[PDB]
Design a protein around this ligand. Structure first.
Ligand code: APR
Ligand code: APR
Lengths: 231, 50, 148
């Protein structure tokens, strides 16, 4: 709200998992610093603004931000993919990710994390293409029954880590939270299936009760005829 | 692009979910028939023993 | 209600199971303290605010809070999952959780608890994906009978 003082040194308090890269234009030296330290700009040091991706449908230019978190966070993206039976369905992935830094004092590897400008959009599309390419080759029944092996061992199929060597970003196991179909017709035929499943469940219960009642009636009738022959 | 092509693929969903629930219903009916035949065979064996 | 004094040292009374991590920006030293102790900020020490998850349907940004409880608590989340018979059903888990600290004086392991910013959202989604992946492979009768 209050206007900042242009004279004072621009200081940005970096969180413990975030990372900011500053470009010292006066000496052409690029340094990236992370930790609890607040970075102080020089006479010409400038922040690396990252036009990231945010929101549910993952708009490509939102959440612009000076920092870059390297901690184990997660972004949830809805992706609308089509199965092999032409039944398109929108589904969500948790996308557990963290930046793997091998050495934290290396001018090249620590500055490699700022290579791709939109790491959240790139890591969403690179994992959306894999999911769409792996689910469209398998039918609806095999996807509705086994929805986790063909989205995790397929998204990062043989290893549990989806490494991205452009920026060092790894992606851990993806946790699906909806596989809800887009069409209301497909959401109604699956409903009709509930009844056919609960209908055959109560029909099996009724048939088992009828068979047990018939067996008990036959046993009681056999005991009655044996007792009548003895009488 | 075409809504006709996006409707014939939809019709395919149902033919896929329809044959899926038909296979489920047929498997349930075959298991019910097998259990009914087993219970009937046990009932006739017990009736012969009675 | 009353406005605080900006001069006085910002002190936060940490409960016995909660944990707060303070970033001493003047010396770039990060320390996390827990117990009955009230932590006092220095000239540039700042709290680690955790934009957690709260509510029943587990909204991802609510309950922002300086502390991080490590005690055996539990968060209840409704998750709407689908069975193998296409009969979707919403169900609740208690999620009994506690942070296991092997050593309480280690600069790295005690600061590892503040790695994920939303531990309640991450621990809900990581346990919601497993539940949805394990229940969708089994039918309604086997899930309604053996639900545990
Ligand atoms: N300024 C930033 N710098 C670097 N990374 C960021 C920044 N802002 C967001 N990110 C990362 O990009 C992701 C984008 O998330 P959103 O789509 O905005 O939120 P959503 O995907 O709905 O849920 C993410 C959830 O994870 C938690 O980290 C966070 O508390 C949030 O609830 C974030 O989770 C975060 O890890
Ligand atoms: N400021 C905080 N810092 C750290 N952890 C927190 C904080 N606030 C909540 N948590 C943890 O996140 C969980 C979120 O819970 P909610 O969804 O808000 O409440 P609910 O899930 O309905 O029930 C939790 C129940 O457990 C008990 O600990 C608590 O008394 C509550 O009744 C809490 O249970 C708590 O363990």
């Amino acid at each position: 709200l209050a206007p900042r003082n242009k004279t004072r040194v621009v200081s940005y308090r970096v969180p413990h998992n975030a990372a900011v890269q500053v470009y010292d234009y006066r000496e052409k030296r690029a340094r990236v610093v992370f930790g609890p330290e607040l970075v102080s700009l020089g006479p010409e040091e400038q922040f690396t603004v990252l036009s990231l991706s945010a929101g549910r449908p993952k708009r490509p230019h939102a959440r612009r931000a000076l920092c870059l978190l390297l901690g184990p966070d997660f972004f949830t993206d809805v992706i609308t993919i089509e199965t092999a039976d032409h039944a398109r369905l929108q589904l969500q992935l948790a996308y557990n990710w963290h930046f793997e830094v091998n050495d934290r004092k290396d001018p090249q590897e620590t500055a490699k994390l700022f290579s791709v400008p939109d790491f959240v959009g790139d890591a969403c599309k690179a994992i959306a293409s894999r999911v769409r390419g792996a689910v469209a080759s398998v039918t609806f029944d095999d996807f509705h029954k086994n929805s986790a092996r063909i989205i995790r061992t397929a998204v990062f199929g043989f290893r549990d880590q989806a490494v991205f060597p452009q920026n060092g970003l790894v992606v851990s196991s993806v946790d699906v939270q909806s596989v809800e179909p887009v069409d209301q017709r497909t959401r109604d035929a699956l409903q009709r299936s509930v009844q056919l499943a609960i209908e055959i469940t109560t029909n099996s219960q009724e048939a088992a009760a009828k068979h047990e009642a018939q067996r008990l009636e036959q046993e009681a009738r056999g005991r009655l005829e044996r007792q009548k022959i003895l009488d």
